[PDB]
């Protein structure tokens, strides 16, 4: 039923908002010409799925075409979000006076507006899931936590997954002082087909049971990833699994026992 | 006037192609449905770049054929199909989003990427170009495309007169059997049948023609796609009257028979 | 004592293995002719050391009878063990130095492609009898070495059942929560029995969704079981747990256990709640 | 007919010398027990092929009588020659920590039987890997003064083909490392630009198929009285792809024992 029309200054993060919608299951068309907007909708109404378009400084038509084109919308209920963005922040993400004026028709009719000035990629993403799903507190909350077996299995765990067989980044003495949050330890593991495959099959196995765990009256679901030391492999896989479900819209929380000291 | 259809398995770099085509000046619309392709085309007549992906491929080619049929007269379609190794795609995946957010879940990442080549077989089997992005970084795939028919020229020269400035390749044949052994041939050239009958009756000349045409055929495809109108292959002996004249015309007739667009020149006989 | 035979295509890291085997303590002889292998072996016996030879494209005798005949005469107090490293065709190509004949001792080859392929054909006798095989394709210099230090220093699977109110068993490697499956406490007749007692078993067996959990778990375990087998791990512990540890977990644990018995594995079952 | 015995203190570069002997065609056995020396030789005598062994501190017997008894037992058809490398204390440490002083000092005692019989002795102290390799061919193949000389030079097509070229190969179609702005100030002698070109399978295959094409004709080009052979590789700028491929081709023929010389026209400005 919902048609999300994303707009905003170039550099504010409209593409990020658009990708986050896709991960939930929206069907998104980027930089579609304004005039064809209704044309798209009728063909997707019969499809029965939620849509998201982007109107960008390269795509805005005379403000009369925008009012005219949005008026011909059939079926589906709309909503227009655009973000504002600091000049120095917009430049850093990538004249400006011509680009601020052109978007004024869109700037004036937007149902929601978001200041993305201080937000990172992950931080803009999660803010937007929150404003289109609601900080739902009465949903199950998934905790993904990384631990080291030599320090003991966390008492609160519901599931425990052993990752000790995957490629060990302590083998490279350059990486030995870093953690799984640090970009080189990550790249070590990404070059291994089996690290990807373990992440994928694990979240797949959880999603098999997530409907039956979400609905029975459970407040938490605790998933513990563990290696020998809790510094490298498990820290990576846990944040990885954790950020996976975040994109699915779920209520997720990550915590790394060995690193929180 | 050109309609750029970017395609490929997820992980192959089509997201890079659109950003590059846009930096080039195309109008880029991502994930426009197939049926509406001409309607976008009709509105632009008064060059565009779209992407056909697993998320919009209609899974029955008749939807693709019908949609391409209604394309306006002012626009010409050209289909780009970036691809990469199965395991390379798996590594490129950033683990935190559905590979196919809009269709049912798969057995494996292996199976996920494999069903995607099966589904994309029509776009790939009509693909004007295919780019194996398997070895490429972010920048270099970009630049390969910004850097985006051949005529081969075989010309014979004499070393005492200097190497032709337009040469790309230079092959020295001064060591092959010298036809100056028969004084009858000494005033003739390699275009005259007797000098040819000498050089042909020596097995070792065929071997050089053979190994040289083989070494060229190794790189001929990669020279064809990169923006070269001409490829100049210069054969040279000492005077430029005998052995080079013959061999150069020989290489020419080979690639002629392979159908190539070939053209010959003899620098020593044209003065 | 061990006679370690390193093999593999050119570019695969056999040279790395020998540097790794040396840091570990082998007496390493590179390119020794096959025929002299027993002669090397007997001469190391009275000194009581394990030695490492490399059989490569430069010494593989093309006639497998020469390798078997030589393997037959090896002394008694030595046990032969064959390692064979390989890599992707093109990865070998990127590894090559460009500046040294690939096969400096025999006929030149059409193609780098045809060279590396000719090499796999010549080494199939060694590859087909290879005790372990290592695809070094994704590995750096250090990690091929360190991988070898790690398993130079057979598995029994334990499936055990517990109750969450009593705490997770300390020896668990994997813990799977089953508290969401059909609860057999619906039948108060079952309430004093355990998951080993036949009526409870017929309960859980009657629900299609219990088989699905049993099936989907052992299949998820099968994904990693090969790598846990080669990883120098003596035991693998899979703990199934419900709230009480009497019914659902006791059954499911015994199920997974009997499954891997049928694939032939080394399994042993345990129930922490029934052992008190 | 030759049996080359490479030795020296650990860190002297004997592994390098051993490999360089292989690239030319010796049959090399590393770390063979000293006692087995004659057994190896008897098996290679029929094979009609020239061999090289290495005697190292990990392999030299503690009593020099076993080494001398063993070397006496060498068969007729092999002629032994013993090469011995030595180097400065600080230099040995440096090559080693890329592979106790009371240990190297106590270990110096072991090698004296070999050192005092050394037919050639080579100071590898100030030498790089390429330099030790090039020196050792010189002391084994002579100064190849009357042999043909191969000249490999890289140029840029925008500056014109060098006049002395005998063969000219165009590589402008290969992955251009100017695509990575990081490489733009470098040359093909700089390690990253090489690493760029190495990840490409066709950069390897081009170097190989070119050196293969040249070796097809080299028997006839060496023999007829020709003093020089000049092979020019050219890309547009003569800074990256050609500079790399040219030196690669050159170091290949260097390892073959040939008389080689490299020159890069655009970089020698």
UniProtKB/Swiss-Prot annotation, chain C:
Signal peptide: none annotated. It comes from Escherichia coli (strain K12). ATP binds at residues 8-15. Disruption phenotype: Cells lacking this gene strongly overproduce the GlmS protein. GO terms for cellular component: protein-containing complex. Homotrimer. Interacts with the small RNAs GlmY and GlmZ. Interacts with the catalytic domain of RNase E in an RNA-independent manner. NCBIfam families: PRK05416.1. GTP binds at residues 56-59. The modification N6-acetyllysine is found at residue 246. This is RNase adapter protein RapZ. Keywords: Acetylation, ATP-binding, GTP-binding, Nucleotide-binding, RNA-binding. Gene3D superfamilies: P-loop containing nucleotide triphosphate hydrolases (3.40.50.300). Belongs to the RapZ-like family. RapZ subfamily. Residues 261-276 are annotated as: RNA-binding.
